[PDB]
Amino acid sequence: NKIRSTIENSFVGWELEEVLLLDMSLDDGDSKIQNQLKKLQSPIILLYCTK
Amino acid sequence: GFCIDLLIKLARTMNFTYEVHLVADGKFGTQERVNNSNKKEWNGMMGE
């Protein structure tokens, strides 16, 4: 929410390319996670996950 | 004037009232900074 709000309020040309919310705690979803990782490829990417 | 007659013509086929309120800024207004942060806010006409 903070990222989106500061992107919208800003006058700078920031272009968000999709949001990745894959869960690593799921079972048998490793192939889906790999597919999503392959699909998404950007020079700059932020991460929000545990250690 | 012109636009007033247009809205009167609109009224006779829409069954609604009106209370004219003239602008309090005297401008059309464009996308401008809020002068408090980086946010851009509407001024002039469209903000009203």
Curated annotation (Swiss-Prot), chain A:
Q: Where in the cell is it found?
A: Cell membrane; Postsynaptic cell membrane; Cell projection, Dendrite; Late endosome
PTM: Phosphorylated on tyrosine residues.
Q: Into which family does the record put it?
A: Belongs to the glutamate-gated ion channel (TC 1.A.10.1) family. NR2B/GRIN2B subfamily.
Function description: Component of N-methyl-D-aspartate (NMDA) receptors (NMDARs) that function as heterotetrameric, ligand-gated cation channels with high calcium permeability and voltage-dependent block by Mg(2+). Participates in synaptic plasticity for learning and memory formation by contributing to the long-term depression (LTD) of hippocampus membrane currents. Channel activation requires binding of the neurotransmitter L-glutamate to the GluN2 subunit, glycine or D-serine binding to the GluN1 subunit, plus membrane depolarization to eliminate channel inhibition by Mg(2+).
Related illness:
Intellectual developmental disorder, autosomal dominant 6, with or without seizures: A disorder characterized by significantly below average general intellectual functioning associated with impairments in adaptive behavior and manifested during the developmental period. MRD6 additional features may include seizures, hypotonia, abnormal movements, such as dystonia, and autistic features.
- SUBUNIT field: Heterotetramer. Forms heterotetrameric channels composed of two GluN1/zeta subunits (GRIN1), and two identical GluN2/epsilon subunits (GRIN2A, GRIN2B, GRIN2C or GRIN2D) or GluN3 subunits (GRIN3A or GRIN3B) (in vitro). Can also form heterotetrameric channels that contain at least two GluN1 subunits and at least two different GluN2 subunits (or a combination of one GluN2 and one GluN3 subunits) (in vitro). In vivo, the subunit composition may depend on the expression levels of the different subunits. Found in a complex with GRIN1 and GRIN3B. Found in a complex with GRIN1, GRIN3A and PPP2CB.
What note about domains is in the entry? The extracellular N-terminal domain (NTD) endows NMDARs with a unique capacity for allosteric modulation, harboring several binding sites for small molecule ligands that act as subunit-specific allosteric modulators of ion channel activity.
Listed name of the protein = Glutamate receptor ionotropic, NMDA 2B
Q: Which organism is it from?
A: Homo sapiens
- Say which residues of the entire protein are included here: 184 to 234 of 1484
UniProtKB/Swiss-Prot annotation, chain B:
Post-translational modifications reported in the UniProt record: NMDA is probably regulated by C-terminal phosphorylation of an isoform of GRIN1 by PKC. Its phosphorylated state is influenced by the formation of the NMDAR-PPP2CB complex and the NMDAR channel activity.
Where found, per UniProt?
A: Cell membrane; Postsynaptic cell membrane; Postsynaptic density membrane; Synaptic cell membrane
| Glycosylated residue positions | 15, 35
Query: What function does this protein fulfil?
Result: Component of N-methyl-D-aspartate (NMDA) receptors (NMDARs) that function as heterotetrameric, ligand-gated cation channels with high calcium permeability and voltage-dependent block by Mg(2+). NMDARs participate in synaptic plasticity for learning and memory formation by contributing to the long-term potentiation (LTP). Channel activation requires binding of the neurotransmitter L-glutamate to the GluN2 subunit, glycine or D-serine binding to the GluN1 subunit, plus membrane depolarization to eliminate channel inhibition by Mg(2+).
Assembly description: Heterotetramer; the NMDAR subunits are modular and harbor tiered domains that function in concert to regulate opening and closing of the cation-selective ion channel pore. Forms heterotetrameric channels composed of two GluN1/zeta subunits (GRIN1), and two identical GluN2/epsilon subunits (GRIN2A, GRIN2B, GRIN2C or GRIN2D) or GluN3 subunits (GRIN3A or GRIN3B) (in vitro). Can also form heterotetrameric channels that contain at least two GluN1 subunits and at least two different GluN2 subunits (or a combination of one GluN2 and one GluN3 subunits) (in vitro).
Q: Which family does it belong to?
A: Belongs to the glutamate-gated ion channel (TC 1.A.10.1) family. NR1/GRIN1 subfamily.
Q: Which disease is it linked to?
A: Neurodevelopmental disorder with or without hyperkinetic movements and seizures, autosomal dominant: An autosomal dominant neurodevelopmental disorder characterized by severe intellectual disability and developmental delay, absent speech, muscular hypotonia, dyskinesia, and hyperkinetic movements. Cortical blindness, cerebral atrophy, and seizures are present in some patients.
Q: What does the entry note on its domains?
A: A hydrophobic region that gives rise to the prediction of a transmembrane span does not cross the membrane, but is part of a discontinuously helical region that dips into the membrane and is probably part of the pore and of the selectivity filter.
**Name this protein carries in UniProt:** Glutamate receptor ionotropic, NMDA 1
The source organism is: Homo sapiens (Human)
Q: What is the lineage of its organism?
A: Eukaryota, Metazoa, Chordata, Craniata, Vertebrata
Q: Which residues of the full protein are shown?
A: 457 to 504 of 938
